[PDB]
């Protein structure tokens, strides 16, 4: 791993062959599936012992065809407001207590009633496996089946999703935090494939209408109905190759307006959020930096956890990857040994790149006034020579981001023996023609956030400046808000 993978991807043909090979290398082996089935069987046996006539249903990564090595094993267990909440919560503990002291081999057990989808976390020691036991999310079964079906509908889906998943992991865009879940990322890829000029994938609405007899099903008041076999459905007339579709993903999602759009897998379309139209129907829908609607539960934004920082970093990383995707290094192979194609996408992010990709949250303000405020803070209060979404190129000959404490101390001392912007500029002027550090500053219309990226950095002091700006700029903007 991390060695074999690099040389395996370097060795093979074109980018598409690399994506396919990546699928081959990351997916679970037959032994891993054997192990998983065995553990599920154990779970099934003990829970049957406690709950006669109960079924343990595997779902998620394990059955949805997007499985990779080391992925979780998710299990659904199939057997007045606060009352029902707590009844539910009590049952969970029971399940927990069964996992804790009955089924042999599982040690880490933590009940999580406080989650949106209450679950009992567990780990099985001999198999090295770990996952979730969910009392009720029945939708998960169906959306898992939907993802597997999606892979079955077109052969480009799984390579695209695998490549983009590994890439997002490498860019710090996915995980269990404010980052996108793997499910949400997959949904985003599928959404992208739905919106192509010829569509690669159909909308879930279309699937729902195709459906079939006996294939009609509703769970929690939502319609989960779709055809069970891909055989009934006509192929895609979209002829685009894998490398193309990848580049198109990067470009497209880099150019989308995320805050103004609820991306709908049902309609295969972007529903304008402002104002209130998606918010009226489907009560319970959370809107924010990134809005991505579940194919079935329509009150569910699967991206609702994503902070503005993660969304901005997402579109930035996609813009960078789109620029790389236009390069000759991407498309064509290398003669001998060089990193080409998928490899720089799958390689870790540079510290300067990782830092510059994630934007800086700024106090709310009209776009025009905000831009003017920022250029004021750069022009004066900082020694920056600046010049002309919005963007500016800035040049510094000095250490201005550091040494400010001693300088202000000395100036206030001269004030002993002897309000923002210009005052702070004093602090700048007392800190002292090839620019020491030169960088770019960008502001996107919605939501307003500043992207600072390095241009000329001889001494590698850009990150210090970036942290400094992270602290200093919201402060400056803030005081410029209160001068009105
Ligand atoms: O918002 C969500 C998230 C997850 N899920 C359901 O839970 C499952 C878990 O989705 P995950 O985001 O955990 O990804 P995954 O399991 O497919 O891959 P690993 O994280 O195991 O590497 C998904 O397959 C989906 O069915 C939802 O229904 N809604
Ligand atoms: Cl597009
Ligand atoms: Mg998982």
Numbering used by the authors: 145 to 223, 329 to 637, 763 to 792, 802 to 815, 826 to 877
Q: What's in the article?
A:
Therefore, the complex structures of TUT1_ΔN with either UTP or ATP soaked in were analysed. The structures of form-II TUT1_ΔN with UTP and ATP soaked in were also analysed, and the structures were modelled and refined to R factors of 22.9% (Rfree of 25.7%) and 24.1% (Rfree of 28.2%) for the UTP complex and the ATP complex, using reflections up to 2.7 and 2.8 Å resolutions, respectively. In the structure of UTP-bound TUT1_ΔN, one magnesium ion is coordinated by the β-γ phosphates of UTP and the catalytic Asp216 and Asp218 residues. The phosphate group of UTP forms hydrogen bonds with the Nη atom of Arg414, the Nδ atom of Asn432 and the main-chain amino-group of Asp216. The uracil base is sandwiched between Tyr432 and the side chain of Arg366. The O2 and O4 atoms of UTP form hydrogen bonds with the Nδ atom of Asn392 and the Nɛ atom of His549, respectively. The N3 atom of UTP forms a hydrogen bond with a water molecule that also hydrogen bonds with Asp543. The ribose 2′-OH of UTP forms hydrogen bonds with the Oδ atom of Asn392, thus discriminating the ribose from the deoxyribose. The structure of the TUT1 nucleotide-binding pocket is suitable for interactions with UTP, through specific hydrogen bonds between the uracil base and the conserved His and Asn residues in the catalytic pocket.
